[model samples]
Target: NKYQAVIIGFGKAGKTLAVTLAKAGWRVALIEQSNAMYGGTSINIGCIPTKTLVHDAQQHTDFVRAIQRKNEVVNFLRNKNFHNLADMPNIDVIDGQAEFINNHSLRVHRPEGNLEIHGEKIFINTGAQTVVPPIPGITTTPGVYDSTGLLNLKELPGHLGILGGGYIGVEFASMFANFGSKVTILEAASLFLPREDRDIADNIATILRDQGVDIILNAHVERISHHENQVQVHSEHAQLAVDALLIASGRQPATASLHPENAGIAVNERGATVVDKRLHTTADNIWAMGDVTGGLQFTYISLDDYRIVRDELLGEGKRSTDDRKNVPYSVFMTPPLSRVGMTEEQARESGADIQVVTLPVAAIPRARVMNDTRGVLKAIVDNKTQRMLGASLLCVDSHEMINIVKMVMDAGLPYSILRDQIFTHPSMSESLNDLFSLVK
Candidate 1:
């Protein structure tokens, strides 16, 4: 069969682009192997499900009810995502595994049989998978789960052991702790949240500890052993007997099944499809987007990749990946940690004359009202330009507040703009006024 565009995965970039091209009168073939993943990782197994659980856990919802709500939300989004493209006149939603037969051709294998598809343009948005480390017995052990698998557990573990202390690990630890599970994080690195400024990282560590989450640093997992219903995690520093274990090590680009090389597409050592800033692969008619490109694994970055590719194909070809600036991200712990731009150390190392300011969450009236006064807010300013360089908010509703700072940074506005702006009283955002005013 032939089409104007063939997208291999129903991820953020591929599904959105499929609708866009289909609406523009282009014949599109959207292929996905699993019906459950119609809406891609965010709505299926990633952010939406995890955050739903996070929200429910914070409300003190029981484990079974939280899981039920997460499933309900995922099903709704997945069905809507499927109908949006599947019902389109010019789009064909095929359920099959796709592999490149050549630069412009793919062979899709379905339970019915095999089919060959040729497209004018090809897109790979296969996203990433969890990286299960090579610890002995990790594969053959019982009661072990990855980030996705843990979410579907029949019942919450009484004592959950998490490997790796990255953002994902921290988030699960926090949520499970709130759900009345005994959570322990074994971090290989000596420093927690090492990328952030030391002060901010220390502050987060303290908060996690105060929440009754155990932090084990410099612990290297040697093996996993099962005894009855419990799993024993043996590490260099300590041994933990946990009711269940979660492998939150990390994630990497998912490109193995596609055999990109068969289509003359080049991949890096890390298995990410190599692409230029415009997301064009070495193959002339093919492109790779989302986690498959090995950029940030955030769904928003994948959506932005769709924009860059859309511009190249439909609008002015001026927009590129280089145009992205001040990208904000959040880790949904109890209070949540949100950040944008450089850390204070990165700013200092760049030789920029900078001033750092911080305020405790206790000082924020909203934090007091919410009864969660357990974080700090910090911002860095360029002394010469009087512009905001970066900011990290580690308090309630920080996830919503960071975007305001991101907007100011993008407009090249001075720190005084945020400091002097009148904001609603008794709100988390109003704390920005006092936070910036401390800058000297």
Candidate 2:
């Protein structure tokens, strides 16, 4: 098979870029090993399914119904994504495992036979996978699940043990706890949310603890022992027995199957495909995108990678990863925690005169009406310029509110703009006025 563009993963960047090339009359071959991953990780497993479960759990929906709804949403998006590209005349959705033969050639292994694909340009968007640590019995122990495995569990465990207290672990803990499960988190690090400011981290810790979540910090799991139907998680400090255990450690790029080295593509020590700011791989005719590029593991970041590559190929090559600013991110906890730019520590470390403002979510009228006043809103500003440096919103609808801050930050506007702006009454977003008003 000969194609103008060959994309090795049916992920965000690959699928969208395939459509773009196909619309331009370029014969594009999009290769994916699993049909279930048609629409990629976000819609299939990572963001959509998890967030759906979170939302349902927050609404007091049972485990089965939440899982069912998640499945329905995933299926609809997967089928729609499949048809959107496969139905195109110039795009061939290849169902097989692709390995690099050279910079411009690949060998796809299908059930029937092997197919050799040659392309003028190749895109690697294989995304990432959950990292299972080297804990003893982590693999052989039954009832131990990764993020994907836990999502597919038909019956919810009465007691769920989560390893690692990072964003993923925190989100899942919040979800299952809300679903009437006794959740215990075994975090190796002494500090919870080490990346976040200490004040915000302390607030979140307090909230999670008050919600009946047993967060064991500085607890390192030595081994896992399974007995009967329960799994015993033995840590340095204590032992916890739960009906199921979830390994929420983290994720790394998925590139083991691609054999990228055969094509002269460089992979880093972390197993991420090495790419430049423009997402160009070591090979001249190859480019890597999404999680595979070792960049931020977000769907929006992957979508932006598509634009960078698209600009490099189809338009003026002014857009690159270097141009991105104020990339806000959110964790779908109870009230959700959204953050953008530097943390308070990072801002201070930069040796600039900075002002910090903090407001309790209880002060927000919208939170009181919503009956979920369980977080704080904090912001950092450059004292000299009065420009907003960063913000951490840990209240209701923070995910949506963070974007507004990001926009203002990117525009280099002062905090007073948000302070003086008249927003609608009794909305979480309107709380921004009160939040920024405290800034001097």
Candidate 3:
């Protein structure tokens, strides 16, 4: 009952790395806190299930149908992840919460009992969780639920009130807006991500507004109260009554519960594991990656973590976290919004001449065809070099269109290349030609 490498959290990076190491003839112990959540948070309760729910709600008029579709997607992804890793001969799945006993040893608590194992290498991919802000009436409210607890809803609430209008909050805002729930997003500021350049955030804000999300800004949620079947929500500026309340304020890394202090791992005040360029923790052999390391929450970045760790553990030592590209990210609402590099403010702050282009989605005929005219396509180009520095797309399938923008930024391609490229008619990509149409 020993291994050369023991991976904790069984998440995207962990399970994937375990299979790779196992195939490389390394004995691996893959551990998860729950038997049902053996493949970690993403496939079980996070990305796959939630995104499926969001996507279906947008397409279906019936709540019952949307819920059913959501359940089916979760089931499919859960089984896919389970069978994908279960057959790896060199990797064994252990159901338990793992605690570092020392620098090289971990104690796992399982249904049977506790067991201690020592390993030459350890991987920490514990994901992130919602932060319980200082807002009152949260801990005791019976109708309150976290993001992870939403998929198990046997019945739907008549209305939903979400606290905090960050990315996660706005996402649920879009989903519930379509699911026929009276969705009210109690945001302290007028729109979500208020700190982000207002110009860029406004495009995303419009998408939420068109989806029927009741976004209240400059309003603080003073308390969340619940009684009987209805939930009473009180804000500094306004009060709301909804059937359910979800606290998706924002997520911090889930590194505290494991008690990293006992193992000499460095953690910030908010419980994010501190790591270096090689993703190594304070303890030499112990390394942390993915959301737990508190860099970015994208599942792909977690996959990239495997590359960094594997290079340090096996490769010729040419790679590290610094070598990874500053990747683009998307928040999936209807039509979605993707962003990369810097904003106009960030660009100007760097002393570069930032040329900007912004066009309403309606300017492109594709929006009229899809009836998705509530967004904008924005691009920031280098005034002298004409390189596409960064972009934010709020139009349909921006999720897919943004990758082209990312390619432009990474490959150092000129903005005109995308503008002049021929694209299929009536598709979102075709709208790119009109992206800079408004640029003077």
How many steric overlaps are in each model, in order? 0, 0, 3
Q: For model 1, which pairs clash? A: none
> Tens-digit lDDT track for model 2 on 30-74?
999887999889888889899989999988898998999999999
Q: Candidate 3 residues 152-237, lDDT tens each?
A: 77666777888778887877888888877767887776556864667867766666676667777777677877766688888657
Off by over 4 Å in 3: 237-239, 436-440
Better lDDT candidate (1, 3) = 1
For candidate 2, the 10 contiguous residues with the lowest summed lDDT are: 232-241
Off by over 4 Å in 2: none
Angstrom error at residue 144, model 3 = 0.6
Candidates by lDDT, descending order: 1, 2, 3
Candidate 1: regions farther than 4 A off: none
| Candidate 1 overall lDDT versus native | 0.91
Name the TM-score of candidate 1: 0.98
lDDT of each: 0.91, 0.90, 0.78
